[PDB]
Symmetry: D2
Subunit: 422 residues, 4 copies
């Protein structure tokens, strides 16, 4: 029964063609949904009660579109998101962090606009986790956004939105200085021929997967759901194909910001992503990611590939990793393990930000500290296990891979352990 | 010999990649498609696309197959649609560069436990009006196909039956249905109501893969460019859906309300044409050919053996085309199953085979009407040169190009056993 | 039948990985195909008798090597005459006649920088006596090959030059030497004295790989069955060395003292024949063909394009043979470079090309002696039938087998362009 | 180039020219062959063990010290000839030569002692002489038995029973020497610790032209099973009288290593020949060249793909450690082992990194020479009070011994494999350490 679920006959196929032939509509997904959902906040999704339903439906990142609304409007949206998120903090083993992303208005006819400088400063003052920078055309646009965030916004992730021909042509220099990329298909489909957008999307997703940096697929994914309760056949296919392409995140804009079915749109993206993740051909994907990733002398990078290889060898239910900044979890995520990456962290911001990386399930550690560091590490690992049991990730008898470091502080991950549950 | 400009077009840097991941990383929006569009477009005929003048514009835009939806309209209404399609197609007989065959497909209303009384009458109408294809609605098992085959009376055994898979039972009994069908249609409209909407992509990808493995045509259908019923431009999900159906391996793509009742029927056909051309150049032939080759069983059938040899030869020299002589379309279908990058130019004397081969990806039919030569080898040579000269006229070929030519050792269908490498003079 | 798929290591051939291929090798799986790696036997006092030479031809000797490091011109002229008398004693039965090439192995430069005066005289002797091949000793650079070619003069343009790589400089300048040579000999005797003995296997494997990539013949030579100079059976290391030279990709294997001066010349030829047949069935064609195909560059030469198409067609139908008509041997060499499992039966009127194609693995030359038919198409068909009738008599073919036939569109060398699937009747 | 560019700038172009690294980075086996270079020098320690047969040419203590220095890892006693008194003296001379280097625990070289049985002869099973010779082996503490003419699983059970309760730790390597042994290979390997391709008798029992098929098949199946396989007989035969081997002999040694053999053997070459030390030196030189020419890219991929999924933590840690070692070009994998099993499971994936096995068992240190790429270090210190400190001391002993021996350099990365509790069977940890 285990080998009939989660498209396991298709996963064991020797060729991609045979993998397709073995896909089964009766093979139910069992793993937790790994592709994060970004929902745009607006009039249809601003109330605290509506936001609680969206969190339950699967929203991981709340997007605030600074192209519309005042600073007062966006501050109220942030407060409502935080109130809805903290309403579930009473059960720390099931609490779900939700990131807050600021999407800039853009340069317009201009580099960095004066309104963007003010909006970026608002973001730093209100503690946003991510910036989706509109119309990034070159590396200096990213440096300008970074400078506008100042010293107090050093930890904010900058996701560059590629929306025109120049952004596509200068992609390599933009990705090098960005934390990740958004394939902003709305403007891209107006700036370049509509029939070429899929090429730009597939290329950028492939390059981001190669670089190990998050990539978001955005705009008109479930467009018809703005007025209709069910999406079109092209819309469900688009969501599934963005996941199969290798996108870390999928997004909803008008579907959640102004549409009549914001919760249903989140539920639909969740349902499709789960089905598409099980249909991923890990046999070739892992082989290619492994082969393309360069040789490294960084112990976090070396431990990460060793841990993902170990996870596939034993069909590990999860890889539990301790992380301060999210980096050790990101390096595991880049190899696309089938095992869920359960990231235990004390940083509330890192817990929100790792939603950008596919297959990373953040757990915010709020248990009392231990006097001996080795005991404190072990307790964080046991917390990962208990949260995993409660959420359905783990059961007694499962094998897990545990990734830790040799001393406190970020940058010292160097250990991988094979543990039997209970 | 060919130049650096040649190797920058049609996604050739992405085509030469050693891994699928590197192939994706090398896809270039500035690399323009050069090859003729190989995925056929099926357009549904209705009030928005019925007039002879509108049909001429749809043929020019790229429509290869006209679909008549027998769920609506009388026999008199459909007979007039057939006459208007034939009048629009024959209006281009004066120009060899613009004349192109267009198949006529009858889509049945559907079942009741099996074949309905209306379907028996509509299938009889199809035989009497010389339709080329039947898109059989709600096929659930092999006996449904046998009932459609029996209803095609004594005169319609040459009509192709494309089984529409629209429910859970059709998906589960897919192998037995494909075995007795000429091809399959992934009818996503009803499929998305009969099974959970989030599972349709799995059924589509599975059925396309199995049809590619069997070497039988597969159609992707319904809501591909839905928003174009009222809007002049499609959504980002719609262009992605069309491109991904081609990348999945679909032989044909379809338009329903977009061309039958919408405000932009011609623009919807133009959009499918533009996307299909871009997506065909983005196909990773290096792995696709290797897997089709490895999965296809060993064969002692000379047509099957010649076809793989010809496709291998075409890839070796970057052949501009594979010219094949075919009476039933079968030799062209066996070339098409290996997905060559070279266009398969099929020269035939059968008007029906010329229309029907539009079901097979990459097959460009040429109807030959010259009087037969007394010496059979001379008649073969005349047809081969007719393919070469039509290719030069349409932009497929130029002097100095290499072409692969597929023929048999004697007249009559079933004897394909020869592959030749020719330099165009 | 199941019995067919148990022989010639077919379970090991169908394996998905090289490791599983090794695990499936079976000592009870008997070889069925004809031995494809040519045997070169050095002529000397143990192998000069016309009667002894007839036994060596029957045992499998394909090329007779004359070592010009020993003996006078009178001694070598007598060896040539005895070889030709033994070879022509079988010419009365043209369907079974086996051509045998004559190769002249030069003394070398000695302490000199280039072509020695003795080599100039020996090369002129070779041209005057009609030798087919020259094994040029101690080739260190491209200009050494040009000097050998100039010493052969205008009458020796058809002689094949196989460069012997015997020292560090020859290994380092391998690419420039191979470019101007017809092929290479890994002359392990001197190589194992010029470079550390423990590094010879690296030079052998590298040169064989580069010759296979270039599609040019490579010979593995020296001490392959050394102990058989005095003992009736070879050592375990010797049988392993012969098998591994075949698995490495060598076109030819050689015997020196084993046939020139030893007590078991015929048994040494029989031993190389037996090992080579076993090792050829153990070749993992699944990966080898894929890699040769992928590494071979794109080509606009129709002979090259027809050759890959024919080898692909042969693997698709498990063809017993590829019958090719050839004037110079080139069309057979281009088929041989893809290492088909099917025997390449090369039918030629050139007695010299029939002898020289033994340098290419898997090429079985048939010398056609009939004068040309008045109708060229009939002359082509008669030669193909001669290939089939010889193939039946020799055990290559049976009624019911499929064969690939490779021909050209006009008389004369350089116009091969046709591949055809034929059933043996 | 992008997959090695950062490491090329850091380690240098000279690093990537040695140990056949251009051939190792090739995308196909054909390109790997084309890139093999006679000027690319081997850098790694020799991983394929050398078994030398002891006889009149190699019996003296002084000659044995030279053979240990030349690279002999296993001493073979052929019980087809000589009395029990003769073999006991050979064992004592081997032990005296081995213990002459014990003064420096950081360098000492353990040498295994293997007893090769006379065989069944015309009998159907275990002979009476074999029962007595096997009891002699247990009494004299031999590490391995090379069991002659194994034809079925019951033959190895008979050898195991003849070793008694005191010989439970002795490794049984079954010699496959006839058609029945080849046909019943799977049942024999299942109950054996390893296999010897005994080509001498095999080449007489089956056609000589088929021996290479049996050798390649048995090596492949042993590699798949993760059990040691020995290639034996006439590898350097001409060196019995000549100082240099033939071209076929060097090729045979190189191809046995490329086939996947864990051990290579010398019989008359060391037992009675005029050049026993030179024969060991020649096998050492060829094995190092051939090990660098192994195409690890496909070999590791195929071993990984063919090995079934496992829930054994030692097996899971081993694959993770070998993958980590390839990712960083690790100089070594240091493993703590009681029985040798954790080192054997690392060895089955054929890492390029040396497997330095730290053990307190003198017998396990001798026996791990059967596994390719395992370098045994015998730890003699008494246990620390805190188990975690004792584990750390053993890891540091491996690192310090490794640096002092040129296996590790400052700046190198090493992978360290340990367990969560004392005793055999609990290996479950992999660590990445930087050498300072
Ligand atoms: N991102 C991503 C990165 C790496 C690997 C992978 S992989 O393992 O999943 N897969 C590789 C094979 N390719 S393919 O193009 O060689 C193809 C081959 C067929 O034999 C066929 O029949 C259809 C296809 C095909 C092509 C494009 C598609 O989008 C598609 O759905 C199928 C598909 C992706 C994904
Ligand atoms: N000529 C030639 C050219 C192309 C292909 C071929 S091929 O198909 O026959 N070949 C496949 C690759 N392997 S391998 O090297 O990846 C290897 C893998 C194993 O799984 C194993 O068990 C041992 C080996 C092995 C064997 C020989 C070597 O030199 C070596 O380095 C490793 C070699 C054989 C031959
Ligand atoms: O992923 P990051 O940011 O590098 O953090 C990983 C770090 O977490 C740890 O496992 C635990 O560190 P702390 O005890 O400081 O939380 C370290 O050993 C390791 O260096
Ligand atoms: O694809 P099909 O229907 O089998 O037709 C292929 C046939 O066409 C030919 O090439 C030409 O035949 P005709 O002259 O009868 O048209 C035959 O030799 C071959 O058998
Ligand atoms: O292999 P080569 O030397 O190019 O010879 C192949 C030639 O043999 C033929 O098949 C027959 O030619 P001939 O009739 O002159 O012998 C030609 O059509 C072809 O060009
Ligand atoms: O390789 P083996 O025989 O399983 O031994 C590995 C064992 O060695 C250790 O690393 C150390 O154990 P000891 O302290 O008993 O020597 C254990 O944790 C582990 O189980
Ligand atoms: O800004 C965006 O998100 C877009 O244009 O798609
Ligand atoms: O009938 C159809 O085309 C459908 O249901 O998609
Ligand atoms: O000349 C030769 O053949 C040699 O040196 O091996
Ligand atoms: O017994 C042996 O060692 C042999 O036969 O090779
Ligand atoms: K915005
Ligand atoms: K209908
Ligand atoms: K000579
Ligand atoms: K013995
Ligand atoms: Mg935008
Ligand atoms: Mg329907
Ligand atoms: Mg020489
Ligand atoms: Mg023996």
């Amino acid at each position: 029964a285990f080998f009939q679920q989660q498209q396991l006959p298709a996963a064991m196929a020797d060729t991609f063609l045979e993998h397709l032939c073995l896909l089964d509509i009766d093979s139910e997904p069992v793993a937790a949904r790994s592709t994060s959902i970004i929902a745009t906040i607006g009039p249809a999704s601003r109330s605290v009660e509506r936001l609680k339903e969206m969190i339950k439906a699967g929203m991981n990142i709340a997007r605030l579109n600074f192209s519309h609304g005042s600073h007062e409007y966006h501050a109220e949206s942030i407060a409502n998101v935080r109130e809805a998120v903290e309403s579930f903090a009473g059960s720390p083993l099931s609490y779900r962090p939700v990131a807050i992303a600021l999407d800039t208005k853009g340069p317009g006819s201009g580099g960095l606009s004066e309104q963007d400088v003010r909006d970026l400063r608002f973001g730093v003052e209100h503690g946003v986790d991510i910036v989706f920078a509109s119309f990034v055309r070159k590396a200096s646009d990213v440096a300008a956004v970074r400078a506008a965030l100042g010293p107090e916004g050093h930890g904010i992730k900058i996701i560059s939105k590629i929306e025109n021909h120049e952004g596509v042509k200068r992609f390599d220099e933009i990705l090098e200085v960005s934390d990740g990329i958004m394939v902003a298909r709305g403007d891209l489909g107006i700036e370049i021929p509509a029939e070429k957008v899929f090429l730009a999307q597939k290329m950028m997703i492939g390059r981001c997967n190669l670089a190990g940096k998050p990539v978001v697929c955005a705009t008109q994914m479930l467009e018809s759901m703005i007025t209709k309760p069910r999406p079109t056949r092209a819309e469900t296919s688009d969501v599934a194909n963005a996941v199969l392409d290798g996108a870390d995140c999928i997004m909803l804009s008008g579907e959640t910001a102004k549409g009549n079915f914001p919760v249903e749109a989140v539920k639909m993206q969740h349902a499709i992503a789960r089905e598409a993740e099980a249909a991923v051909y890990h046999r070739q994907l892992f082989e290619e990611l492994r082969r393309a990733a360069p040789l490294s002398r960084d112990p976090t990078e070396v431990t990460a590939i060793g841990a993902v290889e170990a996870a596939f060898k034993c069909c590990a239910a999860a890889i539990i990793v301790l992380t301060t900044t999210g980096r050790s979890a990101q390096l595991l995520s880049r190899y696309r393990p089938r095992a869920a990456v359960i990231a235990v962290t004390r940083s509330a911001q890192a817990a929100r930000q790792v939603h950008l990386c596919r297959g990373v399930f953040p757990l915010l550690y709020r248990e009392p500290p231990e006097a001996i560091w080795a005991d404190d590490v072990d307790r964080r690992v046991q917390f990962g296990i208990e949260s995993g049991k409660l959420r359905g990730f783990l059961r007694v008898g499962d094998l897990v891979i545990v990734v830790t470091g040799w001393r406190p502080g970020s940058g010292y991950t160097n250990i991988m352990r094979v543990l039997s549950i209970s």
